[PDB]
């Protein structure tokens, strides 16, 4: 049950945030700034698992841009990294050689791929074909 999904840049700017636990706005800006401080201040052989406040937080570096999620601490951990891997492949397969600016300028569609891949915390489409086909059929409706 993924509690939140964070996409934050190398410099500290925020690129995509998504909350599956309805905590208020000043708490959002405290939690987000603290986690962005945590992950950016870490080395490169530190297993990419951070125990943050009853949450085995999972991140993975795919660019300068960092992707961050947090699973609940009784489930498996590597599968959260593979969820992030699948979401990388879905953003690439919908865009086509996905860029930083393509995430920045077209962030609304990145949220829509995230919505057609995850609602409520878990994975609502294990296929990497049906999700992109359905979202391009939705765009085919316009």
């Amino acid at each position: 049950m993924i509690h939140f999904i964070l996409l934050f840049s190398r410099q500290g700017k925020l690129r995509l945030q998504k909350w599956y636990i309805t905590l208020p706005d000043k708490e959002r800006k405290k939690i987000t700034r603290e986690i962005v401080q945590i992950i950016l201040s870490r080395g490169h052989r530190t297993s990419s698992f951070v125990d943050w406040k009853e949450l085995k937080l999972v991140y993975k570096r795919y660019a300068s841009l960092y992707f961050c999620c947090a699973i609940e601490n009784q489930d498996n951990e590597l599968l959260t990294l593979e969820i992030v891997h699948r979401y990388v492949e879905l953003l690439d397969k919908y865009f086509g050689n996905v860029c930083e600016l393509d995430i920045i300028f077209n962030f609304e569609k990145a949220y829509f791929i995230l919505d057609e891949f995850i609602i409520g915390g878990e994975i609502q489409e294990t296929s990497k074909k049906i999700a992109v086909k359905a979202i391009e059929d939705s765009d085919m409706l316009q």
């Binding site: 795919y62 300068s64 492949e89 050689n97 930083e100």
Partner: peptide, 10 residues
């Protein structure tokens, strides 16, 4: 800049 690098493409 450093932003135009694509994500996957191993």
């Amino acid at each position: 800049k450093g932003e135009n690098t694509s994500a996957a493409h191993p």
